[PDB]
Amino acid sequence: KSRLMGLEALKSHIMAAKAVANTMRTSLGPNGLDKMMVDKDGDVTVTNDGATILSMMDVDHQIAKLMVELSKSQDDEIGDGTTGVVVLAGALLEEAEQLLDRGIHPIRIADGYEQAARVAIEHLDKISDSVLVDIKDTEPLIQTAKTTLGSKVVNSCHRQMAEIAVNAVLTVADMERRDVDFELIKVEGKVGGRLEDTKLIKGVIVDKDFSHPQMPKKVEDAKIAILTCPFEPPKPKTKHKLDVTSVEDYKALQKYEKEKFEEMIQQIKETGANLAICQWGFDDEANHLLLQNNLPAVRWVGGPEIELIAIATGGRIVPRFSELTAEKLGFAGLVQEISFGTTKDKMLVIEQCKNSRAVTIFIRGGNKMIIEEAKRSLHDALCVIRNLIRDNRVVYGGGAAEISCALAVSQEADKCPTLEQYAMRAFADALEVIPMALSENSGMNPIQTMTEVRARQVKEMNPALGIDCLHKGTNDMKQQHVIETLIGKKQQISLATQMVRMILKIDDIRKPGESEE
Amino acid sequence: RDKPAQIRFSNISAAKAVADAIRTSLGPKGMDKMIQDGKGDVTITNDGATILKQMQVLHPAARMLVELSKAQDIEAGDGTTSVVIIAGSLLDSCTKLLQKGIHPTIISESFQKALEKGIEILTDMSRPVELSDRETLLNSATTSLNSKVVSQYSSLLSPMSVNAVMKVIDPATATSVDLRDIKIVKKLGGTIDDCELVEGLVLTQKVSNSGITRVEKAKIGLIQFCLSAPKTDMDNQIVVSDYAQMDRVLREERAYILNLVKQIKKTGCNVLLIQKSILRDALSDLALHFLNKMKIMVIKDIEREDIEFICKTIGTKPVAHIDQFTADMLGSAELAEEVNLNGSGKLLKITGCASPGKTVTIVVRGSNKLVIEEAERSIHDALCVIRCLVKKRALIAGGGAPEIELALRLTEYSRTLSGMESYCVRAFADAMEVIPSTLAENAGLNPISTVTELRNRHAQGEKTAGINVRKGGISNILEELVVQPLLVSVSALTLATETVRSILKIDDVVNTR
């Protein structure tokens, strides 16, 4: 048993609270600098937000450990603001240190932080607009759909994913009653075309099994016939011996395929489509011979995928070929083989207007590195509109809001006073750091920047202006088109305040001898 | 370089480190000190105020401190500790800024911006009181006096300071009655009750012997002529190889001087201030013995101090040789007075002296010097607080709580300044709240409760109200029976605004060689 002083721990707390908070401070936004991950494998990786780098970074102190825990939630709901809470945590916390170094209870001021949260939250609740709407949000989408695709993989903002990503949301947004999930929409990374090659699908796209193109490539109807079972003679995606007794019996063998093509074709068709995903992969022969005979079937399929298309259709899979049902086939408002990539076979596009609980954006990329970085890019703008569709409210922030919410709380300190007064004072300065800390990452004096809008905040409060996160000569928010769902910042307000509280949790600083051991 | 960086911090190191334990400020707080010095001693020390003047601290930023302390005395007469208690207050804020990396000269004028508005917020919390008014003069001095070492004699001491001023004061509103005007003159014997307020020039010098002139028609002046005689100012050809040659000049020496002191008293001199210069003699010991036979007040090689007051107050001029008679440039004096009270002390009082309308001489008496000095120090803050009223009209608080009253405000003033300085001044604007706890601090155990809540209390008392540091409890400190003229506190900012800012200037170090 080795018990240390909470102070000493508070050191190890604050000693952990720095580099992670620091990590963002020159990494904040595009004016921030990239975050490199080199692995236990020694693998160089350029990383982003907190949670990307935070999980990749191997957490050591309880804070570091607690970081990723807290940090995930902001990217979950909001998609953005993950980088901020870690900055915000230490910023206030490392003064809370200094405050406790004044001989101040963590006890007493942290309430004031919890309490100044709300009044900044409420000050936040003043900021910007309470509303976005289906056509409205699109431009604020386009705003963020700029900066989200104007950030990671390209800064170009292809309006492709910019308005493809929102549509999947906009498609599943209303579906969930003003809600969405990112299974319910999906980023489909598959290459074969560049970033500029993307798609939005109402369902699954799979590269359609063909054992020969001349044996007809046929897609039709709107419907897929979903089968765990054969549409052409089965096989468990493994080796199988095909033998015949005499020279002639090889010909009768294909008849069996040929008949059980149509026998399954005629069986599975009447129950809908002709297109039957067959989890069973087959030898070259019957596949193309059915492609020949009629109505291609999809073979060599992921058990998840026959399941994925089913749950996408909201109906089932047909498990048994002796069995069959229409619900156990596909509900799809379109099924079409469509040329997939520039490099490979036509994908089978199942876009489900019969039943789709999931509407998936598809992305090609010229590399995995870029198609993943775009895959990495999207979820953010995907998640911010997830906030929007539930609450369409956004806040101009990043140098408008921090110093704004800090100013009232700076004033609230003097209204409130005692333990909350140096809470709400220190509560505020942490906010004002982030826009400051952007000119940190940016090329500008972080002080005089914060000073700048500090003058502007004295001038005007909750401005459509702000700092320059894009480092434009104009320091704006509206015309920076920087903004966040007022969900997010508030949600982002919660977390560090949550965590700087969580370091206070109850009492116990004793261990068995094992705390980090 | 690192040296400019470190030496400032090293200057910030020493001076700040001193100013902290320099705050037990006031109170009956913290345990008494012997002091074993830097080169060694045992120095039993008490009352940081005098200790501040006693303080020898030697280090580039330490020397400005002793200065800083002594100035607020001559600036006010009060707040001697108070200028330093806000010194380390400034010395902290600089760090976080230089820790924020803010430029020191940008930090420098922030002190002005702090001093500029700070005195106005002090001027705002200043409760203006009349500088010529007996009551405000009484009451303000009374707060000092009731806090001084004699709160009893204070009743007799304040009207003296009130009347010392009002005589010396320029009529109606005035910045007047300096401590140069006031001549505080001790007199052995008498009583503190017998401490006397004389409007005129009383020179503290000890009159030769007694039974001399107490009568009217003095002539006092500093006379730089000497009394000639054989073997005094006058030529002799006679080397002494014999006893008679030794005696002959003496018989002519004392007689001729005896007829010179007549010319002095013939001049009308009931006093002379003898030049500190001599040749062989100047005025001899027999000469003074002869001058005192003629009732001429004489003090041989008179202290240079009473030399100046008689030239300052009366306008005394050099005087012609006594064989030339005089220029009658002895200052105008209608009274040569030697007072003896408790049968003790010899005190020249020149009354009817030429006086500007200023130069009160408070005669300080007592059964002992310690008895003398109690009121003498007490009546001084009776003088000075009133003088602080005269020099500046207001009653603020004492004790440093109204600093927190400036602190809540000047914070927002920075917050309104909205500059980099708004961060620079504000970092101090709150950091000035430190003193009331640091007054309390140096005594005991179980520390924490009062410290943080003090600034909180006043903060909850907001701008108009706060906790009284001396009397405790939350009530507006400006009028308590804890009070000061605002002159006291504003100078503390001024003095500290600069000497501290002077450290911001230092880059690296030199030593004149």
Swiss-Prot record, chain A:
The keyword Amino-acid biosynthesis does not apply. One of its GO terms (molecular function) is ATP binding. InterPro entries: Chap_CCT_epsi (IPR012718), Chaperone_TCP-1 (IPR017998), Chaperonin_TCP-1_CS (IPR002194), Cpn60/GroEL/TCP-1 (IPR002423), GroEL-like_apical_dom_sf (IPR027409), GROEL-like_equatorial_sf (IPR027413), TCP-1-like_intermed_sf (IPR027410), TCP-1_chaperonin (IPR053374). Its EC number is 3.6.1.-. Mg(2+) binds at D80. Pfam families: Cpn60_TCP1. It comes from the Eukaryota. Ubiquitinated by the DCX(DCAF12) complex specifically recognizes the diglutamate (Glu-Glu) at the C-terminus, leading to its degradation. ATP binds at G29, T82, T83, G398. There is a cross-link at K186, K190, K241, K251, K255, K368 (Glycyl lysine isopeptide (Lys-Gly) (interchain with G-Cter in SUMO2)). Keywords: Acetylation, ATP-binding, Chaperone, Cytoplasm, Cytoskeleton, Disease variant, Hydrolase, Isopeptide bond, Neuropathy, Nucleotide-binding, Phosphoprotein, Ubl conjugation. Its main location: cytoplasm. Signal peptide: none annotated. GO terms for cellular component: cell body; centrosome; chaperonin-containing T-complex; cytosol; extracellular exosome; microtubule. ADP binds at G29, G81, T82, T83, S151, G398, D468, E484, K489. It is linked to Neuropathy, hereditary sensory, with spastic paraplegia, autosomal recessive: A disease characterized by spastic paraplegia and progressive distal sensory neuropathy leading to mutilating ulcerations of the upper and lower limbs. Belongs to the TCP-1 chaperonin family. This is T-complex protein 1 subunit epsilon. It comes from Homo sapiens (Human).
UniProtKB/Swiss-Prot annotation, chain B:
ATP binds at G27, G79, T80, K148. One of its GO terms (biological process) is protein stabilization. The modification Phosphoserine is found at S10, S158, S176, S418. Mg(2+) binds at D78. One of its GO terms (molecular function) is unfolded protein binding. Its EC number is 3.6.1.-. It is linked to De novo genetic variants in nearly every subunit of the TRiC complex, including CCT4, have been found in individuals with a broad spectrum of brain malformations, and clinical phenotypes ranging from mild to severe epilepsy, developmental delay, intellectual disability, ataxia, and other features of cerebral malfunction. Component of the chaperonin-containing T-complex (TRiC), a hexadecamer composed of two identical back-to-back stacked rings enclosing a protein folding chamber. Each ring is made up of eight different subunits: TCP1/CCT1, CCT2, CCT3, CCT4, CCT5, CCT6A/CCT6, CCT7, CCT8. Interacts with PACRG. Interacts with DNAAF4. Interacts with DLEC1. This is T-complex protein 1 subunit delta.
